[PDB]
Amino acid sequence: DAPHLLIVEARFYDDLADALLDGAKAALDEAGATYDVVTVPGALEIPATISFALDGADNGGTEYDGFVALGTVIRGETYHFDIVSNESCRALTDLSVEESIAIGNGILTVENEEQAWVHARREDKDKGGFAARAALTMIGLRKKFGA
Amino acid sequence: APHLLIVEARFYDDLADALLDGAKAALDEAGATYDVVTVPGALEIPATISFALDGADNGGTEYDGFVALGTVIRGETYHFDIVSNESCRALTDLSVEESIAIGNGILTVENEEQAWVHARREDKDKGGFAARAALTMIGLRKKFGA
Amino acid sequence: APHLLIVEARFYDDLADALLDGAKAALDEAGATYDVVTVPGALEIPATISFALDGADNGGTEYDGFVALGTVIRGETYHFDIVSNESCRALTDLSVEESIAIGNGILTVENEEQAWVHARREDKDKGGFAARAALTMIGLRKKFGA
Amino acid sequence: APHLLIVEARFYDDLADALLDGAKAALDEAGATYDVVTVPGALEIPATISFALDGADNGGTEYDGFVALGTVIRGETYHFDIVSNESCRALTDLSVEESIAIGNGILTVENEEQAWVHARREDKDKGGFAARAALTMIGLRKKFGA
Amino acid sequence: APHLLIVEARFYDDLADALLDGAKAALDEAGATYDVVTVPGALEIPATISFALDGADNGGTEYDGFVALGTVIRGETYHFDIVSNESCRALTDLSVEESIAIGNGILTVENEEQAWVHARREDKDKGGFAARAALTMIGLRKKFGA
Ligand SMILES: O=c1[nH]c(NC[C@H](O)[C@H](O)[C@H](O)CO)c([N+](=O)[O-])c(=O)[nH]1
Ligand SMILES: O=c1[nH]c(NC[C@H](O)[C@H](O)[C@H](O)CO)c([N+](=O)[O-])c(=O)[nH]1
Ligand SMILES: O=c1[nH]c(NC[C@H](O)[C@H](O)[C@H](O)CO)c([N+](=O)[O-])c(=O)[nH]1
Ligand SMILES: O=c1[nH]c(NC[C@H](O)[C@H](O)[C@H](O)CO)c([N+](=O)[O-])c(=O)[nH]1
Ligand SMILES: O=c1[nH]c(NC[C@H](O)[C@H](O)[C@H](O)CO)c([N+](=O)[O-])c(=O)[nH]1
Ligand SMILES: [Ca+2]
Ligand SMILES: [Ca+2]
Ligand SMILES: [Ca+2]
Ligand SMILES: [Ca+2]
Numbered sequence: 197d198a199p200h201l202l203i204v205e206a207r208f209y210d211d212l213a214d215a216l217l218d219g220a221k222a223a224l225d226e227a228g229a230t231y232d233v234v235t236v237p238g239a240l241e242i243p244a245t246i247s248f249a250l251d252g253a254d255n256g257g258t259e260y261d262g263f264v265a266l267g268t269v270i271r272g273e274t275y276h277f278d279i280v281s282n283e284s285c286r287a288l289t290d291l292s293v294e295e296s297i298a299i300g301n302g303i304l305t306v307e308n309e310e311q312a313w314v315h316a317r318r319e320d321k322d323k324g325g326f327a328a329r330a331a332l333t334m335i336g337l338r339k340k341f342g343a
Numbered sequence: 344a345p346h347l348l349i350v351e352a353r354f355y356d357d358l359a360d361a362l363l364d365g366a367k368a369a370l371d372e373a374g375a376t377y378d379v380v381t382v383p384g385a386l387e388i389p390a391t392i393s394f395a396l397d398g399a400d401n402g403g404t405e406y407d408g409f410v411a412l413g414t415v416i417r418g419e420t421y422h423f424d425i426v427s428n429e430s431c432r433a434l435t436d437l438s439v440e441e442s443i444a445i446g447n448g449i450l451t452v453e454n455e456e457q458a459w460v461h462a463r464r465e466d467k468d469k470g471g472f473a474a475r476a477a478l479t480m481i482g483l484r485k486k487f488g489a
Numbered sequence: 490a491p492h493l494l495i496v497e498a499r500f501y502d503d504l505a506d507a508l509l510d511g512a513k514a515a516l517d518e519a520g521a522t523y524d525v526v527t528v529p530g531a532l533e534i535p536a537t538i539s540f541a542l543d544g545a546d547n548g549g550t551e552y553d554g555f556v557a558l559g560t561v562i563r564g565e566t567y568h569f570d571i572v573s574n575e576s577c578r579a580l581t582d583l584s585v586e587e588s589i590a591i592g593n594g595i596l597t598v599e600n601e602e603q604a605w606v607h608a609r610r611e612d613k614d615k616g617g618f619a620a621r622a623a624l625t626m627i628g629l630r631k632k633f634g635a
Numbered sequence: 636a637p638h639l640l641i642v643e644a645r646f647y648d649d650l651a652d653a654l655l656d657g658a659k660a661a662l663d664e665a666g667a668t669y670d671v672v673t674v675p676g677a678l679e680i681p682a683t684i685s686f687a688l689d690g691a692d693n694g695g696t697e698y699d700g701f702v703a704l705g706t707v708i709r710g711e712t713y714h715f716d717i718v719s720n721e722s723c724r725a726l727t728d729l730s731v732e733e734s735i736a737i738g739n740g741i742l743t744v745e746n747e748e749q750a751w752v753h754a755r756r757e758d759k760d761k762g763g764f765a766a767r768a769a770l771t772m773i774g775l776r777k778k779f780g781a
Numbered sequence: 782a783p784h785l786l787i788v789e790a791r792f793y794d795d796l797a798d799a800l801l802d803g804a805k806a807a808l809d810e811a812g813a814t815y816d817v818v819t820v821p822g823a824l825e826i827p828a829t830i831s832f833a834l835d836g837a838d839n840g841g842t843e844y845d846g847f848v849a850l851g852t853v854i855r856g857e858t859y860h861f862d863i864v865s866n867e868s869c870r871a872l873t874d875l876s877v878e879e880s881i882a883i884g885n886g887i888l889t890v891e892n893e894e895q896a897w898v899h900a901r902r903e904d905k906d907k908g909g910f911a912a913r914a915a916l917t918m919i920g921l922r923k924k925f926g927a
């Protein structure tokens with residue numbers, strides 16, 4: 197009866213990933229929701245992964261009520277940092293719309309590691325918790341609208 | 344009488360109130376009805392409209408149009424620019440792909456000051472503008488017989 | 490003679506008049522006829538063309554092409570490059586997905602000065618260029634027998 | 636022998652000539668045949684390829700590949716970035732979604748000086764590079780038996 | 782034993798070799814096999830994977846995953862961000878729409894220096910990272926039973 201979420205975490209920056217995951221798990225536990233955690237190398241493969249889960253579900257696999265995308269992108273000198281954020285979020289958005297699924301976006305895109313922590317920590321901006329809660333809210337709306 | 348779904352990303356509460364106030368006032372004056380659904384951020388507004396559409400296709404409330412409200416204030420983190428681009432990008436695709444009337448009231452400003460200049464109905468009234476746009480689009484949807 | 494639908498985003502009233510004047514001159518000059526539909530902003534131009542396409546598939550007016558007109562001036566707020574990007578993005582995709590003739594006259598400028606330099610038929614004439622591009626695309630569409 | 640469609644966005648005539656010369660040369664050298672269709676700007680190149688594909692699916696000329704030729708020179712207007720992004724973005728989706736071989740010779744430069752360095756066959760020969768890329772992709776299209 | 786398709790955009794030959802060496806080393810170390818196909822630039826990598834997918838649906842080599850390798854160095858021209866943007870964008874959509882395992886080794890850097898810091902297996906080894914990312918995705922694709 198409790199929603200079962202799939203947390204797809206891009207573990208590029210491990211310590212930041214743990215902050216986000218701790219934020220997300222905290223919010224889900226707190227809400228009485230259960231979850232599975234899957235780790236991917238970077239934000240770029242987060243959408244594909246949710247896609248794998250959806251197709252998996254259609255093949256009798258675990259059926260997730262929603263998803264929590266966790267990740268961190270720190271703009272350094274390279275332009276690929278803009279690309280990771282943009283493409284991962286872009287694909288997630290399209291995904292949430294095209295598949296009409298509940299997705300909490302916890303993909304952090306900051307200038308430096310200092311703000312990354314400010315957003316990743318549950319003690320701070322708690323983006324991971326905000327994302328997990330966002331997924332729940334969307335799970336509720338998805339249910340309300342009878343999508 | 345058109346019945347709209349107002350989807351507000353209530354990130355900044357005060358601003359959200361201003362925008363919603365603008366949207367509601369504009370629709371009231373046009374004699375249009377509406378429901379208000381709340382989401383945490385602009386990023387979930389498009390999926391929300393999607394939910395509404397699927398629900399409608401499942402016998403649920405059928406909406407004539409949508410008013411998306413939200414506010415994104417660019418501070419320091421590169422995270423603000425993405426919220427604006429995606430939400431509005433997704434809304435644009437959605438309006439086209441689904442051929443629906445969408446008033447885009449997702450405010451993307453530099454700082455809180457201009458946010459209020461745009462959010463307040465006494466000012467630029469972005470919320471009202473978006474609501475009116477939805478009505479205009481609802482009318483065009485009907486004129487072309489879409 | 491080709492019959493085009495001119496979809497103008499009337500945000501800046503005077504600049505819209507300039508683009509519209511430019512678009513009409515080019516079409517009148519070419520002998521093409523047209524209807525003009527007005528929307529509040531560039532963001533609703535793609536959906537409007539979408540409405541017209543579905544309207545036509547429902548026995549409504551069949552347009553040979555489209556001329557999208559609009560102007561976005563990048564001021565101080567971040568709510569400008571998004572309008573042009575998304576409006577143009579959806580227009581391009583629409584032209585490919587639906588294989589239709591679309592003249593893109595959505596003007597994206599840094600300031601009011603270039604807006605006028607591009608919007609005036611007497612100058613850059615962005616509207617006429619878009620109108621002419623639409624006609625060109627109508628001819629190519631027929632030439633390829635698409 | 637592969638037969639390709641060169642779609643040239645002829646906005647800057649001289650540069651267009653340089654790019655076209657480069658593309659034709661590369662195609663001639665490879666013993667490939669080609670048709671040339673001209674469009675006003677890079678923005679209509681993707682729809683044009685789309686017209687040709689639908690045309691082909693209606694018994695029209697069947698092309699083995701495409702060579703998109705164009706030039707965008709970034710100056711002041713933000714519309715220059717849009718043309719570059721949109722045309723190239725649509726071409727890419729088109730190459731993927733339709734599984735066709737496309738050589739991208741849409742030159743996006745800062746100034747005219749570098750435009751010539753890239754456009755001239757004697758120089759960087761962007762046109763020939765795009766023509767050669769199209770050929771390469773045609774061969775690959777066949778190697779995979781897609 | 783997974784069989785991957787390495788699609789390398791060989792624009793800067795030496796850097797391409799660094800990335801390929803990094804990709805093969807990672808795949809050989811995992812016991813995975815692979816075929817290597819060369820394209821002229823990052824813009825054709827997505828269409829190439831598309832070719833491989835179709836070819837597979839026509840009884841061609843069935844790949845368990847893909848490793849996209851390439852390098853884009855941002856200079857003065859704006860044609861650099863577009864190559865990285867579109868290629869990566871196309872790859873991302875492809876991986877989602879086709880539910881395929883794709884390791885993105887398309888290196889987007891500002892200068893030759895970071896290009897070398899990332900392409901060398903001895904250093905950041907983006908080629909190996911992409912290859913390993915592809916393997917991880919292959920494993921996940923199977924764990925989820927997609
Ligand atoms: O999640 C992230 N992934 C990153 N890797 C890119 C991509 O997400 C994939 O892991 C890999 O490129 C191949 O799929 C990042 N950077 O490279 O900087 C980053 O900041 N964040
Ligand atoms: O509506 C907004 N949402 C924001 N959050 C992003 C997103 O809309 C979602 O709430 C959440 O990311 C997970 O879905 C914002 N910022 O982060 O700055 C903002 O300014 N405005
Ligand atoms: O056509 C324009 N519409 C604008 N409005 C945005 C949008 O096009 C819609 O009118 C409205 O947002 C709700 O749909 C603009 N700005 O806001 O700056 C602009 O410059 N040009
Ligand atoms: O090919 C180009 N077309 C341009 N026109 C834009 C577009 O390609 C179409 O021609 C027209 O806008 C209507 O579709 C350009 N600029 O405006 O600068 C440019 O630099 N290059
Ligand atoms: O892989 C790359 N291809 C490049 N060429 C662009 C494109 O990838 C194709 O090779 C060609 O344009 C025709 O499709 C690059 N630049 O132009 O700079 C680059 O840096 N990297
Ligand atoms: Ca750790
Ligand atoms: Ca009809
Ligand atoms: Ca001046
Ligand atoms: Ca045929």
Ligand SMILES: [Ca+2]
Pocket residue numbers: 837838839840841843
């Ligand atoms: Ca097969």
Ligand SMILES: [Ca+2]
Pocket residue numbers: 894
């Ligand atoms: Ca250095």
